[PDB]
Design an enzyme around this catalytic site. Structure first.
Site, PDB file in Angstrom:
ATOM      1  N   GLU A 143      -7.882  11.829   9.584  1.00 26.77           N
ATOM      2  CA  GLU A 143      -8.357  11.624   8.216  1.00 26.77           C
ATOM      3  C   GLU A 143      -9.689  10.882   8.258  1.00 26.77           C
ATOM      4  O   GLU A 143      -9.743   9.712   8.662  1.00 26.77           O
ATOM      5  CB  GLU A 143      -7.353  10.834   7.384  1.00 26.77           C
ATOM      6  CG  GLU A 143      -7.756  10.746   5.914  1.00 26.77           C
ATOM      7  CD  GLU A 143      -7.892   9.324   5.387  1.00 26.77           C
ATOM      8  OE1 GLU A 143      -7.727   8.355   6.145  1.00 26.77           O
ATOM      9  OE2 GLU A 143      -8.171   9.185   4.170  1.00 26.77           O
ATOM     10  N   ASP A 171       0.828  -1.211   0.000  1.00 24.46           N
ATOM     11  CA  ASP A 171       0.000   0.000   0.000  1.00 24.46           C
ATOM     12  C   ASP A 171       0.861   1.259   0.000  1.00 24.46           C
ATOM     13  O   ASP A 171       0.534   2.250   0.645  1.00 24.46           O
ATOM     14  CB  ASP A 171      -0.969   0.003   1.192  1.00 24.46           C
ATOM     15  CG  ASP A 171      -2.188   0.891   0.970  1.00 24.46           C
ATOM     16  OD1 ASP A 171      -2.278   1.587  -0.066  1.00 24.46           O
ATOM     17  OD2 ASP A 171      -3.071   0.866   1.851  1.00 24.46           O
ATOM     18  N   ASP A 226      -4.314   8.501  10.174  1.00 26.59           N
ATOM     19  CA  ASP A 226      -4.800   7.784   9.002  1.00 26.59           C
ATOM     20  C   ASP A 226      -5.968   6.880   9.361  1.00 26.59           C
ATOM     21  O   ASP A 226      -5.962   6.221  10.405  1.00 26.59           O
ATOM     22  CB  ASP A 226      -3.658   6.959   8.408  1.00 26.59           C
ATOM     23  CG  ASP A 226      -4.116   6.069   7.252  1.00 26.59           C
ATOM     24  OD1 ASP A 226      -4.500   6.612   6.204  1.00 26.59           O
ATOM     25  OD2 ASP A 226      -4.084   4.844   7.415  1.00 26.59           O
ATOM     26  N   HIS A 278      -3.325   0.138  11.989  1.00 28.54           N
ATOM     27  CA  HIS A 278      -2.792  -1.160  11.597  1.00 28.54           C
ATOM     28  C   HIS A 278      -1.291  -1.100  11.396  1.00 28.54           C
ATOM     29  O   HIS A 278      -0.700  -0.030  11.226  1.00 28.54           O
ATOM     30  CB  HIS A 278      -3.476  -1.655  10.316  1.00 28.54           C
ATOM     31  CG  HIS A 278      -3.599  -0.597   9.264  1.00 28.54           C
ATOM     32  ND1 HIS A 278      -4.739   0.161   9.101  1.00 28.54           N
ATOM     33  CD2 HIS A 278      -2.725  -0.170   8.322  1.00 28.54           C
ATOM     34  CE1 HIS A 278      -4.567   0.997   8.089  1.00 28.54           C
ATOM     35  NE2 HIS A 278      -3.350   0.823   7.606  1.00 28.54           N
ATOM     36  N   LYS A 295      -5.178   3.774  -8.522  1.00 27.63           N
ATOM     37  CA  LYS A 295      -4.601   4.960  -7.892  1.00 27.63           C
ATOM     38  C   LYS A 295      -3.282   5.364  -8.546  1.00 27.63           C
ATOM     39  O   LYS A 295      -2.888   6.529  -8.442  1.00 27.63           O
ATOM     40  CB  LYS A 295      -4.408   4.726  -6.387  1.00 27.63           C
ATOM     41  CG  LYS A 295      -5.717   4.837  -5.597  1.00 27.63           C
ATOM     42  CD  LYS A 295      -5.515   4.609  -4.095  1.00 27.63           C
ATOM     43  CE  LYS A 295      -6.847   4.611  -3.346  1.00 27.63           C
ATOM     44  NZ  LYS A 295      -6.663   4.436  -1.880  1.00 27.63           N
ATOM     45  N   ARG A 318      -1.006  13.198  10.982  1.00 21.95           N
ATOM     46  CA  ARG A 318      -2.241  12.766  10.345  1.00 21.95           C
ATOM     47  C   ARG A 318      -2.642  11.419  10.924  1.00 21.95           C
ATOM     48  O   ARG A 318      -1.858  10.471  10.881  1.00 21.95           O
ATOM     49  CB  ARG A 318      -2.018  12.671   8.830  1.00 21.95           C
ATOM     50  CG  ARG A 318      -3.182  12.155   7.994  1.00 21.95           C
ATOM     51  CD  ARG A 318      -2.708  12.075   6.538  1.00 21.95           C
ATOM     52  NE  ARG A 318      -3.750  11.740   5.579  1.00 21.95           N
ATOM     53  CZ  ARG A 318      -4.097  10.500   5.259  1.00 21.95           C
ATOM     54  NH1 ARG A 318      -3.502   9.469   5.848  1.00 21.95           N
ATOM     55  NH2 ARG A 318      -5.031  10.289   4.348  1.00 21.95           N
ATOM     56  N   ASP A 341      -4.848   9.793  -2.893  1.00 19.58           N
ATOM     57  CA  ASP A 341      -6.056   9.024  -3.135  1.00 19.58           C
ATOM     58  C   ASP A 341      -6.835   9.652  -4.300  1.00 19.58           C
ATOM     59  O   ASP A 341      -6.378  10.603  -4.951  1.00 19.58           O
ATOM     60  CB  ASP A 341      -6.924   8.959  -1.878  1.00 19.58           C
ATOM     61  CG  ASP A 341      -6.310   8.097  -0.771  1.00 19.58           C
ATOM     62  OD1 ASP A 341      -5.544   7.165  -1.088  1.00 19.58           O
ATOM     63  OD2 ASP A 341      -6.600   8.361   0.412  1.00 19.58           O
TER      64      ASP A 341
END
Length: 520
Positions: free
Chosen positions: A260, A54, A219, A92, A430, A217, A323
């Protein structure tokens, strides 16, 4: 207050390797004369840290990935007067993280046996066991479940006693096999009930502060709190309790928290966050500015601008980011009314698709799609690959209240990267909006008006004290937009015409008046 602590500087946004292979490449670019005092903030995406899947959001640890970034790059950015914004991917960690590796090595004896979430434990007595071994939540529970993929948010892993166990995995996973060997990577959700997780949060905040972070941030923050029988998107009051606890830790390190959350406007989550003195992302402006430009009318955009003032909303706004363009964010939620009618959002999606965009939807556990979510496309392409429309969108972005985040690829007017979006083995659609630029790309761009004109506006927005003062919408007819900032005797005025796509910027400072314009 925390909202008041949000720095009002222009904020660059990129991957550490977006410019010439590594973060040193971005520094070199930022050292050019054209970039002098352009940015006072830099949101570096989490592949600056050790990570796998990711593109950065599957975190191994929060040390720097030496292939892409070093402390010397951070010192060079500080030398340029650039404050840092980083993620804490608190929902995570990667399977490859030391915590999860220790879980797989020592299993039930591991000190991290409560750090992640055992799915079958979590749903004990609340579902029947599937043939495959995992617990299927009861229909009453499964219905309510917010799903970011088909099936259940689980990854099967192998424990050292030879058992196969199921661990919560809301987002990415990778399962590789050959002969007898099943290997897996994945974003394994953290147990927010574990004191060890909260100890890791505190240490991570200290690490980020040491790097020179000013903004952290949070997430996917709405996904953190999990509970049987709830949706697990912004569960309350649990999500508020976690946030206030992070706030305390954040304040001890002098950091600004930016959660976020892609909430539908009609849920008013953004209003609750603001009323609790938290800055928020402005995920409404991207679609509103496209609609305002595509229709040559300010009606919907002005309504949102007025609510920012009336509700005192501190935002980080943007055109593009890593994104897609948010579209669900514009809806009215379960009962409310959106910032654009449903039909207007859908027609915008159609146009964006005509321009090469690729829609990204949300699907429930039962496979039935819930709604469109984002549209994958570069902002330059979303606006029809028009330099004048991109100049206008930037100018409007810079004069709307909020900290303006600048996507490196929009700065260089990158169009849809169709090749990358369809490449086998890439991260999918993306990639259409994540093109890596070489030093040559950067150089050639610094001779282009669409790049230079944006930089001229950016440098003004980052330096003029006018934007530290009072904001005003000067009344015009609905086809124009006149936005004014005044701080004492310093005045910045955007006079924009949505029908002709023309605009000028007037800056009065120290009795000198200068005019910015890119048509005459």
């Amino acid at each position: 207050g925390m909202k008041a602590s949000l720095p009002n500087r222009v904020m660059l946004n990129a991957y550490p390797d977006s410019i010439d292979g590594d973060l040193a490449g971005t520094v070199r670019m930022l050292q050019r004369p054209e970039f002098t005092d352009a940015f006072g903030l830099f949101y570096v995406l989490p592949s600056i840290f050790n990570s796998d899947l990711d593109r950065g959001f599957s975190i191994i640890d929060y040390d720097l990935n030496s292939d892409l970034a070093s402390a010397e790059d951070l010192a060079a950015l500080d030398e340029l007067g650039i404050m840092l914004k980083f993620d804490m991917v608190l929902n995570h960690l990667s399977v490859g993280s030391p915590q999860f590796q220790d879980l797989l090595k020592h299993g039930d004896d591991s000190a991290f046996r409560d750090f992640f979430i055992d799915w079958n434990e979590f749903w004990e007595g609340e579902g029947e066991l599937h043939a495959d071994g995992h617990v299927v939540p009861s229909p009453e529970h499964l219905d309510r479940l917010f799903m970011r993929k088909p099936g259940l948010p689980i990854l099967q892993v192998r424990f050292p006693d030879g058992s196969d166990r199921f661990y919560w995995n809301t987002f990415y996973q990778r399962v590789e096999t050959i002969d007898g060997e099943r290997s897996y990577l994945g974003q394994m959700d953290l147990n927010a009930e574990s004191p060890r997780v909260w100890t890791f949060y505190r240490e991570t905040f200290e690490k980020l502060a040491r790097y020179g972070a000013k903004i952290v941030r949070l997430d996917a923050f709405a996904y953190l709190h999990k509970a049987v029988g709830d949706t697990n998107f912004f569960n309350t009051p649990g999500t508020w309790d976690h946030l206030d606890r992070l706030r305390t830790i954040s304040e001890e390190n002098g950091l600004v928290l930016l959660p976020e959350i892609h909430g539908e406007y009609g849920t008013k989550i953004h209003e609750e966050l603001s009323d609790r003195d938290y800055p928020v992302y402005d995920f409404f402006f991207p679609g509103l500015v496209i609609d305002a430009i595509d229709s040559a009318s300010n009606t919907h955009l002005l309504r949102w601008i007025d609510e920012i003032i009336e509700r005192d909303i501190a935002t980080v706004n943007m055109l593009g980011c890593h994104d897609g363009i948010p579209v669900i964010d514009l809806k009215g939620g379960p009962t409310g009314q959106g910032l654009l009618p449903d039909a207007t959002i859908e027609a915008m999606i159609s146009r964006l698709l005509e321009r090469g965009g690729r829609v990204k939807n949300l699907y429930g556990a039962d496979g039935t799609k819930v709604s469109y979510y984002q549209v994958n496309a570069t902002f330059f392409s979303a606006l029809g690959e028009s330099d004048a429309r991109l100049r206008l969108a930037r100018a409007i972005q810079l004069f709307v209240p909020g900290t303006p985040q600048v996507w490196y690829l929009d700065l260089f007017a990158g169009a849809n990267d169709v090749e990358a979006a369809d490449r086998a083995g890439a991260d999918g659609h993306k990639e259409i909006n994540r093109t890596n630029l070489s030093a040559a790309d950067v150089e050639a761009g610094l001779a282009r008006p669409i790049v230079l004109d944006q930089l001229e506006m950016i440098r003004l927005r980052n330096a003029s004290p006018a934007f530290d003062g009072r904001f005003e919408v000067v009344p015009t007819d609905d086809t124009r937009l006149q936005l004014r900032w005044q701080n004492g005797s310093t005045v910045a005025l955007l006079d924009a015409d949505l029908a002709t796509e023309r605009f000028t910027i007037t800056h009065e400072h120290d009795g000198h008046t200068e005019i910015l314009g890119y048509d005459l």
